[PDB]
């Protein structure tokens, strides 16, 4: 049973970034960090965490393809979304402080690392931050977020059909989920599960009536309808900037922040769509400290969790650490953890084991402590 097995430092110090897993490597894009520059013209960022060697690397700046043309790469931003379809990360949305939000679709090839901006057609969603993105087949689904031009929360679903690069504003049936940002949306089968996020209890505008959603909402992509679903007797506290992932057919949500309670979270909740029920999960080991707007990616039976913001022991810090939650720890993993914990001499061990012990106990050098 599931356990926090790795805690590593020296990664990118980022919150409000976006990341996808490609094989056993996690690609992290952009994000915010206090004290660093989010006004001037900077290229967006790509750091890669290797989940076998447990090393962070960073990709070098994008160069101009032809003299006189600018490099093709999104500007440094936060609150954007990234999804993976085949060999392509689709990056959309977000903002920086200067240029605000842009709604240009960006594509990133995970093998060649070239960026491009495929020509799209249809009703392009307005620029926004804090939306959710998820995919089913060749279709990307964008929901929610805070629209920069309309200046409002969104409860639209825009789908991008990457086969033709065509945006559709979906005319949904049923009661749409409440306008909101910094929610999550997770695909389980053909159904999109929307949880949490910041919202207004009366409408799509800020009005000093901010609320933290916890009535999960379900969107069927086959019939493009919001479903009416049974009550959940037990449910997690409302929150924003949690992480959501689907593993073995079930939804998991980690962490987040509730402003009404002024509380950061490091809990773990499982939702089973079939029983339609929630359950708080207690992993073994010391997890990450309560935090919000970290990123979570799935690598086999493990979740790579890294980044985010939390209060500083009003006085927030950004995280360069990284955690691994292992849903099914091998005996070898439990024994390395014991050898580390009891601080036993490792020089008897064969070099393959020692390489592993070293990997899980050595910081990367993207960042230094503040």
């Amino acid at each position: 049973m599931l356990r926090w097995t790795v805690h590593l430092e020296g990664g990118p110090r980022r919150v409000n970034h976006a990341a996808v897993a490609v094989g056993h490597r996690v690609y992290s894009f952009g994000g915010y960090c206090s004290g660093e520059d989010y006004e001037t013209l900077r290229q967006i960022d790509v750091h890669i965490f290797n989940a076998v060697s447990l090393r962070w690397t960073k990709l070098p700046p994008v160069k101009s393809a032809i003299r006189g043309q600018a490099p093709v790469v999104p500007y440094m931003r936060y609150g954007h979304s990234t999804v993976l379809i085949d060999d392509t990360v689709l990056l959309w949305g977000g903002r920086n402080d200067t240029e605000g939000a842009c709604n240009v679709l960006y594509a990133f090839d995970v093998n060649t690392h070239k960026w491009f901006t495929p020509r799209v057609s249809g009703t392009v969603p307005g620029a926004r931050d804090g939306h959710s993105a998820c995919v089913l087949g060749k279709i990307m689904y964008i929901f929610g977020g805070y629209e920069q031009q309309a200046d409002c929360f969104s409860n639209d679903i825009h789908k991008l059909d990457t086969s033709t690069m065509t945006w559709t504003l979906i005319c949904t049936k049923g009661s749409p989920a409440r306008w909101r940002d910094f929610h999550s949306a997770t695909m389980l089968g053909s159904h999109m599960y929307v949880f949490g996020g910041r919202a207004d209890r009366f409408g799509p505008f800020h009005s000093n009536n901010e609320i933290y959603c916890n009535r999960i909402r379900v969107f069927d992509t086959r019939t493009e309808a919001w479903l009416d679903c049974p009550p959940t007797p037990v449910l997690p506290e409302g929150r924003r900037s949690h992480s959501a992932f689907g593993y073995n057919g079930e939804l998991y949500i980690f962490g987040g922040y509730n402003a009404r309670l002024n509380r950061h979270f490091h809990d773990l909740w499982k939702f089973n769509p079939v029983s339609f029920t929630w359950k708080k999960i207690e992993p073994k080991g010391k997890g990450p400290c309560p935090r919000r707007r970290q990123c979570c990616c799935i690598v086999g039976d493990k979740i790579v969790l890294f980044g985010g913001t939390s209060p500083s022991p009003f006085d927030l810090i950004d995280h360069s650490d990284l955690h691994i939650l292992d849903f099914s720890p091998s005996l070898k993993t439990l024994c390395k953890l014991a050898v580390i914990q009891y601080n036993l001499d490792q020089s008897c061990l064969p070099h393959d084991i020692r390489w592993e012990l070293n990997a899980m106990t050595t910081n990367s050098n993207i960042s230094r402590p503040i």
């Binding site: 050898v339 036993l344 064969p350």
Partner: protein, 89 residues
């Protein structure tokens, strides 16, 4: 249905074949060309613990109810780690 795992000091451990398959190494050995396995290098106090891990793993896979941890005494951790690495489990 059951298989026999013999330790270096000659203890015999009879475990469900499905449990022993938790070890990739044993999985390979039971499917060799042309049932029991002799481990000339793993003593009984280590191999008994490995079998308990088999039982624990199969029983608690895809389980979310809270359960005890798999206890690993310091005096056994280095040998157990070397065994788990050799057994790919």
């Amino acid at each position: 249905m059951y298989v026999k795992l013999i330790s270096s000091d000659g203890h015999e451990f009879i475990v469900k074949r499905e449990h022993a398959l938790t070890s990739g190494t044993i999985k390979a050995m039971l499917s060799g060309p042309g049932n029991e396995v002799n481990f000339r290098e793993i003593p009984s106090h280590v191999l008994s613990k490995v079998c308990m891990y088999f039982t624990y793993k199969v029983r608690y896979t895809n389980s979310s109810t809270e359960i005890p941890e798999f206890p690993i005494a310091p005096e056994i951790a280095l040998e157990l780690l070397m065994a788990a690495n050799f057994l790919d489990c």
